[PDB]
Curated annotation (Swiss-Prot), chain A:
Changing residue 41 to E: Strongly reduces affinity for SDC1. It is found in: Cell junction; Cell membrane. The gene is TIAM1. Disulfide bonds: none annotated. Belongs to the TIAM family. Guanyl-nucleotide exchange factor that activates RHO-like proteins and connects extracellular signals to cytoskeletal activities. Activates RAC1, CDC42, and to a lesser extent RHOA and their downstream signaling to regulate processes like cell adhesion and cell migration. It is linked to Neurodevelopmental disorder with language delay and seizures: An autosomal recessive disorder characterized by global developmental delay, intellectual disability, speech delay, and seizures. Additional features may include axial hypotonia, peripheral hypertonia, hypothyroidism, and non-specific dysmorphic features or brain imaging abnormalities. Component of the Par polarity complex, composed of at least phosphorylated PRKCZ, PARD3 and TIAM1. Interacts with NTRK2; mediates the activation of RAC1 by BDNF. Interacts with MAPK8IP2 and CD44. Interacts with BAIAP2. Interacts with EPHA8; regulates clathrin-mediated endocytosis of EPHA8. Interacts with PARD3. Interacts (via PDZ domain) with CNTNAP4, SDC1 and SDC3 (via C-terminus). Found in virtually all analyzed tumor cell lines including B- and T-lymphomas, neuroblastomas, melanomas and carcinomas. Residues 7-70 form the PDZ domain. The chain holds residues 841 to 929 of 1591 of the full protein. This is Rho guanine nucleotide exchange factor TIAM1.
UniProtKB/Swiss-Prot annotation, chain B:
It is found in: Presynaptic cell membrane. This is Contactin-associated protein-like 4. It comes from the Eukaryota. Presynaptic protein involved in both dopaminergic synaptic transmission and GABAergic system, thereby participating in the structural maturation of inhibitory interneuron synapses. Involved in the dopaminergic synaptic transmission by attenuating dopamine release through a presynaptic mechanism. Also participates in the GABAergic system. The chain holds residues 1302 to 1308 of 1308 of the full protein. Belongs to the neurexin family.
Length: 91, 7
């Protein structure tokens, strides 16, 4: 335990920027792909919404991480908004 | 199959 799960909705209409300011690493463990937050721009929108390095992305737009692919993801993050299910440590 | 994405 120690980990908490919460939903995040981020919208591009808040910033002059067209990007959210974070990076993800993708890795396959025992046939299943997991997504982790690699870095978060301190001044970016993702940081503003509480995303942190080391967080795990469980879902994007209600789709499990292992069921996403790259073209699907590039599409979702170029849209005006996107929803995330994130597993994180408090603080 | 370690990929990385920037968003």
């Amino acid at each position: 335990m120690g980990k908490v799960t919460h939903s995040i909705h981020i919208e591009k209409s808040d910033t002059a920027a067209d990007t959210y300011g974070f990076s993800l690493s993708s890795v396959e463990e025992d046939g299943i792909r997991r997504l982790y937050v690699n870095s978060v721009k301190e001044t970016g929108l993702a940081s503003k919404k509480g995303l942190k390095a080391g967080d795990e992305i469980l879902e994007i737009n209600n789709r499990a991480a292992d069921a996403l692919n790259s073209s699907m993801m590039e599409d979702f993050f170029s849209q005006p908004s996107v929803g995330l299910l994130v597993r994180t440590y408090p603080e | 199959n370690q990929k990385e994405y920037f968003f």
